[PDB]
């Protein structure tokens, strides 16, 4: 007998299950994934997404760093080699450890992991079809839909798991492709392209839109594109793929650019133009759940669906398709079910791109602030002259703040540089506390540290950074 | 002619000068240092302190990582070697670039750098004795004393800057010593010891006191001692040096620990038992400035001396001997001179140790909180299970929070691990905003990041971390 049934065992689903167990609910988490013959919790994030991509980014970064960034330190290595199979096996081991860890967490919280598929029926009943055995009809009072996402498909570039792959296949190439095409220049394509480029592939990253990273602050995307291009990442803009032709162990990409039909041949092609909500087999025709024209489950600000007691979260519903967004939505849904007015602040959700250097941002871009009626003032300071960055040999990028000129209210923070993914949390925290730019100016930041650039950027908003020319 | 005269061109002094110039004052900064044959600003921090030590820590960390932490990633190399002269030259070039940078900042701000010594005479008069030129007596309205510090000297281990060196010589060894003795297990000794150990030295560190890092939280110092010892730093607690003996190119350290007289021989010995205020040639006998006990210029909370119009900042006065403390006291002194009730919060000053892994803390330790009357609750979470840390091969250490059990007020943060120097700024900001533990619990931290360990530790304070087994 379960009070709450969660359909989906990804970041959203398992976080919700754990929080519910902490609050006294009798919980079931239904998750169908079987990864290399083992049922596995963790969703996209752990099994074929965030974690594996971060592992390959770290290993490939170490390789590039060893070949190209040791000479200035007076360090020599002679030959430098990588064994791709060992590099990939390390990633697989990390994934195994982490998915085993979540399984242990559910067991420790007294949560039952139902291995199989779940479907929401009328009256909030849930059909559980196990991998092996008798189908069960559960009758919970509450249900959290957390079915996540899958890759967007491009009909003219069909994935075959061999020459043309999606992000899953891109994390598993058995050899480094000599020529690699990547369709999509969002966070996923930039990261996957960087991994293989560092390991020796000649990479072309296609972006069909006329703009690079459209949701990022324009100053950030402009500088970031410049930085990635400088590293050898060939980002091709205004290129719309119109067809593909697989001939043996090669694939030719036909694309339109500047009104002309062009072509380029690659050894492997990655299709990563985004992800879409996945809800196949999620809802019975009489579930009573309202859908949107774009394929999402409709919810309000608190993730509540049209059916009382049924919440929907993560990549399945509106908002940035990020792991932490799914996790906090899971917690919010459970707390709401339990009567607490929990709320995710969608204006303080962090975005990170794990390239090197990293890019990260939170809050409003300069354009968004202007669009929303703010009289805007901005300020930025670079890592180029930062003592810590020079010592580390990582003097590139900057910290930019967006603020209100009338109230001095901090509205957004945009960063490219060392420790960007952890530095952006400083801005996120300041935003949660409704910080003014002055609040940050009055604080003592450690010296020498990458973080003091944050302080200098705060001073620069009012044109008074100490170390500015 | 000058409104303000600052005696000392270290972080405290030049920071004060620039702020003063921004506020419209005509400023003179008197700095005597002659480094590598020419006059140079930046003080201890830039010339023989923070910056050069950070450069060597980074290069030595690269060497160690290349020898020992590439195999797990499937990366192999030929025989790894380092050219010590070139490694040191890199550090020297970074210091030269930075010192030149400060010089051009003073000129850009319309500040006159007087190259020579300064002395506060009666009636706020200041005697400038240039290195080359006529001596002049200036009559400013305000004076800031920022003469800084120098190492503590111990007649038992006299510095010849060859066999027995202080922190300055320790940053310039012409060859890696096979056996290195380090007197002092403070931040500086742990860092200098780590540099040379990484480069091949067999290192022993003597600490006179019965405790390791007594100002740190006990849980942090305990784990940190274990980590550093396992790396190869033989940290000898309660080891009091009674004498040194130099025999040719070797030095025997005689010392007492646990009741027994012992000795060991080394190729080099570093003396870094702390730093003391430096005020030689700073004050005329009739300057009118008050003193305390050991050797500090007495000042109130705003760095005001007993003489109206005269302030004293940085290592010259009470408080943590840190660059950022000097920097903030310099800005405070200048804003007080200008009429504003500026204030430095000494309970939010960050301490960082730049070993690998890094250690960092801010606020109250668990013992300090109890001493001040708080009913204390604590929470901690480790990087060992953090996905980002596993991906990076940095899975060690933890984040620990100290908080009041009755009011939920956050009191301190203590970190060992990846990005510690930057993660600790998150705690610093939360303390500046008078954060409760619940405030941090309700925030969305990015996933996967080292920073989400902060969130888990906040939740662990109330025994509800989602990922705690
Ligand atoms: C290559 C790549 C890299 C990424 N990198 C990052 C990053 O750096 N940072 C970041 O924040 N995000 C990243 N993401 C996105 C992140 O993985 C998702 O935002 C996150 O996994 C969404 O979590 P979720 O719980 O909503 O859905 P999912 O993680 O997709 O989990 C849903 C789970 O439910 C299961 N399921 C679906 N339907 C049913 C059913 N009817 N019955 C039983 N089980 C079902 C699925 O098997 C799936 O495992 C990345 C994604 C990819 C593909
Ligand atoms: C090896 C080492 C590593 C360190 N690492 C760190 C770290 O990681 N983080 C950190 O926060 N701190 C660190 N410190 C400490 C830091 O360098 C000091 O706290 C900081 O430099 C203090 O700045 P200041 O302006 O008070 O004095 P100083 O930096 O000492 O500057 C004072 C300057 O004034 C000059 N002077 C003195 N008397 C006169 C006079 N009468 N006339 C003219 N000039 C005069 C001196 O020559 C000196 O150049 C380190 C120190 C050392 C030795
Ligand atoms: Cl994808
Ligand atoms: Cl695939
Ligand atoms: Cl913008
Ligand atoms: Cl201490
Ligand atoms: Cl303690
Ligand atoms: Cl005294
Ligand atoms: Mg066009
Ligand atoms: Mg306020």
Q: B333-344 burial, b if ≥16 CB within 10 A, otherwise e?
A: bbbbbeeeebeb
Q: Is A22 helix (H, G, I), strand (E, B) or coil?
A: helix
Q: Does B15 reach chain A within 8 Å, measured CB to CB?
A: yes
Helix (H, G, I), strand (E, B) or coil at B116: strand
CB contact under 8 A, A422 and B451: yes
For residue A261 the two structure tokens come to 């039909």
Contact B103, B41 (CB under 8 A): yes
Residues 372-431 of B with CB under 8 A from A: 385, 387-388, 390-393, 419, 421-426, 428-430
Q: What whole-number distance in Å separates Cα of residue A372 and Cα of residue A375?
A: 9
The verdict on A353 and A254 lying in the same domain is no
- Judged by CB atoms closer than 8 Å, whether chains meet at A83 and B74 is answered as yes
Is the separation of the CB atoms in B413 and B400 below 8 Å?
A: yes
C-alpha to C-alpha distances, B347 to A429, B343, B350, B412, nearest whole angstrom? 19, 12, 9, 9
Q: Does B75 touch chain A (CB under 8 A)?
A: yes
- Identify the residue whose C-alpha is closest to ligand 2 atom 19: B322
Question: What is the count of structural domains for chain A?
Answer: 3
> Do residue A59 and residue B51 have CB atoms under 8 angstroms apart?
no
Q: In 3-state terms, what secondary structure has residue A334?
A: helix
**CATH number of residue B373's parent domain:** 3.30.390.30
Pick among A429, A433, A453, A460 to test the B interface (most B CBs inside 10 A): A429
Quickly tell me which residue has 């043309």 as its tokens. Answer: A164
* Residue where a domain terminates, one of B347, B379, B409: B347
Cα-Cα-Cα-Cα dihedral sign, residues B51, B53, B59, B61: negative
Q: Whole-angstrom Cα distance, residue A313 to residue B42?
A: 53
Q: Using alpha carbons only, what angle is made at residue B443 by residues B439 and B445, rounded to the nearest 5 degrees?
A: 140
Q: Give the determination technique.
A: X-ray
Which chain B residue has its CA at the smallest distance from A82's CA?
B75
- DSSP-assigned beta bridge partners for residue B310: B143
Residue A461 Cα to ligand 10 midpoint, Å, equals: 17
Interface contact B84-A105, CB threshold 8 A: no
| A58 CB within 8 Å of a chain B CB | yes
Q: Which two tokens stand for residue A154?
A: 């491009």
Q: Rounded to the nearest whole angstrom, what is the distance from the C-alpha of residue A433 to the centroid of ligand 10?
A: 8
Integer Cα distance of A12 and A327 in angstroms: 4
Q: A136 and A7, same structural domain?
A: yes
Residue B16's CB is within 10 A of a number of other CB atoms, namely 32
Full residue range of the structural domain in which residue A94 is found: 1-151+274-347
- Is the domain of A356 the same as that of A439? yes
Please give the number of the atom of ligand 2 that sits closest to the Cα of B167: 1
Closest residue by Cα to residue A30 from A55, A8, A13, A61: A8
Number of H helices and E strands in chain A, helices first, is 13, 26
Q: Which ligand is nearest to the CA of A256?
A: 9
Judge if the beta carbon of residue B99 lies within 6 A of ligand 2.
Answer: no
Q: Is A127 helix (H, G, I), strand (E, B) or coil?
A: strand
Q: Could you tell me the resolution of this structure in angstroms?
A: 1.8
A102: tokens are 């979540």
* Phi then psi dihedrals of residue A221, to 5 deg: -65, -40
Instruction: Provide φ and ψ at A127, rounded to 5°.
Output: -90, 115
Are B1 and B139 part of one and the same domain?
yes
Mutate to test the pocket of ligand 2, among B323, B331, B353, B358 (most ligand atoms within 8 A of CB): B323
User: Do A313 and A245 share a structural domain?
Assistant: no
Q: Chain A closest CA to B387's CA: distance in Å? A: 7
For residue A423, the chain B residues in CB contact (below 8 A) are 422, 425
Token pair 């803390």 is at which residue? Answer: B361
The CA distance from B304 to B300, in Å, is 6
Give chain B positions within 8 Å (CB) of A46. Answer: 387
Ligand 2: residue whose CA is nearest its atom 22:
B323
Residue B335 sits in the same domain as residue B365 = no
What the block records as the tokens of A307 is 């059916």
Same domain for B327 and B375?
A: no
A41 in contact with chain B, both atoms CB, cutoff 8 A:
no
**DSSP for residue B369:** H
Which residues have any ligand 1 atom within 6 Å of their CB? A 7-13, 30-33, 43-45, 49-50, 53, 117-118, 146-149, 167, 188, 278, 281-282, 314-315, 321-324, 326, 354; B 447
Dihedral pair phi/psi, residue A83, rounded to 5°: -110, 100
Query: What CA–CA distance (Å, rounded) separates B38 from B28?
Result: 19
The closest alpha carbon to A458, from A433, A430, A416, belongs to A430
Task: Collect all residues of chain B within an 8 Å Cβ-Cβ radius of residue A413.
Answer: none
* Closest ligand 2 atom, residue B192 Cα: 1
CATH number for position B69: 3.50.50.60
Q: How far is Cα A465 from Cα A440, in angstroms, rounded to an integer?
A: 12
Chain-chain contact of A51 with B450 (C-beta, under 8 angstroms): no
Residues of B taking part in catalysis: 447
Give A183's strand partners: A206, A271
A73 CB neighbours in chain B (<8 A) are 58-59, 62-63, 82, 86-87, 90
Rounded Cα–Cα distance for residues A429 and B431 (Å):
11
Per the document, the length of chain B is: 469
Q: Is B282 in the pocket of ligand 2 (CB under 6 A)?
A: yes
The answer to whether residues A170 and A261 belong to one domain is: yes
**Domain match, A97 and A130 both:** yes
Q: Where are the alpha helices (DSSP H) in B69-144?
A: 84-108
Residue A229 CB: number of other CB atoms within 10 A? 12
Pseudo-torsion of CA A337, B443, A375, A469, nearest 10°?
-170
Ligand 1: atom nearest CA of A170 is 1
Residue B34: Cβ within 10 Å count: 11
CA of A468 to the centre of ligand 7 (A): 40
Structure tokens at B360: 């960092």
For ligand 2, whether the C-beta of B56 sits within 6 Å is: no
Task: State how far residue B88 is from chain A, nearest Cα, in angstroms.
Answer: 8
d(CA A206, CA A202): 13
The verdict on A110 touching B (C-beta cutoff 8 Å) is no
- B461 within 8 A of B437, measured Cβ to Cβ: yes
Do residues B261 and B177 both lie within one domain? yes
Looking at the structure, do residues B230 and B301 belong to the same domain, yes or no? no
Helix/strand/coil (H/E/C) assignment for every residue in B282-346: CECCCCCCCECCCCCECCCCCCECCCCCEEECHHHCCCCCCHHHHHHHHHHHHHHHCCCCCCCCC
What does residue A107 show for φ and ψ, rounded to 5 degrees?
A: -55, -45
> Which residues of B, range 329-358, sit inside 8 Å of A by Cβ?
344-345, 348-350, 352
Angstrom distance (rounded) from CA B67 to CA B82 = 11
Which of B76, B385, B422 minimises the CB distance to A422?
A: B422
**Residues A255 and A286 both lie in one domain:** no
Please answer whether residues B189 and B354 qualify as being in contact, where contact means their C-beta atoms are separated by less than 8 angstroms.
no
Exposure string of A195-225, with b = 16+ CB inside 10 Å and e = fewer, is bbbbbbbebbbbbbeeebbeebbebbbebbb
**Residue ranges in B152-257 assigned as alpha helix (H):** 167-170, 187-198, 218-231
Rounded to whole angstroms, the Cα distance separating A100 from A329 reads 23
Among B16, B17, B32, B45, say which to mutate for ligand 2: greatest number of ligand atoms within 8 Å of CB: B45
Phi, psi of A12 (to 5 degrees): -65, -55
Hey, are the CB atoms on B448 and A323 less than 8 Å from each other?
Answer: yes
- Smallest CA–CA separation between B453 and chain A, in Å? 11
- Using an 8 Å Cβ cutoff, are A319 and A326 in contact? no
Catalytic residues of A: 447
Q: Are A345 and A381 in contact (CB under 8 A)?
A: no
Whether B51 sits inside 8 A of A449 (CB atoms) is no
- Which among A317, A347, A377 is the end of a domain? A347
- Tokens at A316, concatenated: 């399945």
First-to-final CA distance of chain A? 69
Q: Which of A246, A273, A300 is the last residue of a domain?
A: A273
Phi, psi angle pair for A406, to nearest 5°: -75, -45
């Amino acid at each position: 007998q379960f009070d709450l049934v969660v359909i989906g065992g990804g970041p959203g689903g398992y976080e919700a299950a754990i929080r519910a167990a902490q609050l006294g609910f009798k919980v079931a988490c239904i998750e169908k994934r079987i990864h290399n013959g083992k049922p596995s919790l963790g969703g996209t994030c752990l099994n074929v997404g965030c974690i594996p991509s971060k592992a390959l980014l770290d290993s490939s970064h170490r390789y590039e760093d060893t070949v190209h960034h040791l000479a200035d330190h007076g360090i020599t290595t002679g030959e430098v080699n990588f064994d791709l199979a060992k590099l990939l096996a390390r990633k697989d081991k990390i994934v195994d450890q982490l998915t085993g860890g979540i399984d242990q967490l559910l067991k420790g919280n007294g949560i039952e992991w139902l291995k199989g598929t779940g479907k929401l029926l009328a009256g909030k009943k849930v059909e559980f079809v196990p991998h092996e055995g008798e189908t069960q009809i559960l009758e919970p009072k509450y249900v959290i839909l957390a079915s996540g996402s899958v890759p967007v498909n491009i009909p003219v570039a069909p994935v075959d798991q061999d020459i043309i792959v999606d992000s899953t296949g891109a994390l598993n190439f058995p050899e480094v492709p000599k020529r690699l095409g990547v369709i999509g220049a969002g966070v996923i394509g930039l990261e996957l392209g960087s991994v293989w480029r560092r390991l020796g592939a000649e990479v072309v990253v296609f972006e069909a839109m006329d703009a690079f990273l459209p949701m990022a602050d324009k100053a950030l995307s402009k500088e970031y594109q410049k930085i990635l291009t400088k590293q050898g990442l060939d980002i091709r803009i205004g290129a719309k793929v119109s067809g593909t032709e697989v001939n043996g162990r090669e694939v030719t990409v036909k694309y339109t650019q500047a009104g002309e039909d062009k072509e380029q041949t690659f050894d492997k092609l990655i299709v990563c133009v985004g992800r879409k909500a996945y809800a196949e087999g999620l809802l019975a025709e009489d579930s009573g759940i309202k859908l949107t024209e774009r394929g999402l489950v409709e919810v309000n600000d608190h993730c509540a669906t049209s059916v009382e007691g049924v919440y929907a979260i993560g990549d399945l519903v509106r908002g940035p398709m990020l792991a932490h967004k799914a996790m906090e939505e899971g917690v919010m849904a459970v707390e709401r079910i339990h009567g607490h007015a929990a709320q995710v602040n969608y204006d303080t959700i962090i975005s990170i791109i794990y390239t090197h250097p990293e890019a990260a941002w939170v809050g409003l871009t300069e354009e968004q602030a202007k669009e929303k009626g703010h009289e805007v003032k901005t300020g930025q300071f670079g890592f180029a002259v930062n003592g810590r960055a020079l010592a580390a040999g990582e003097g590139a990028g900057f910290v930019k703040f967006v603020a209100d000129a009338k109230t001095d209210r901090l509205l957004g923070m945009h960063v490219i540089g060392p420790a960007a993914s952890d530095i952006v949390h400083q801005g996120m925290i300041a935003l949660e506390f409704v910080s003014s730019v002055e609040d940050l100016q009055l604080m003592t930041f450690g010296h020498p540290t990458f973080s003091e650039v944050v302080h200098e950027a705060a001073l620069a908003v009012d044109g008074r950074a100490i170390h500015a020319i």
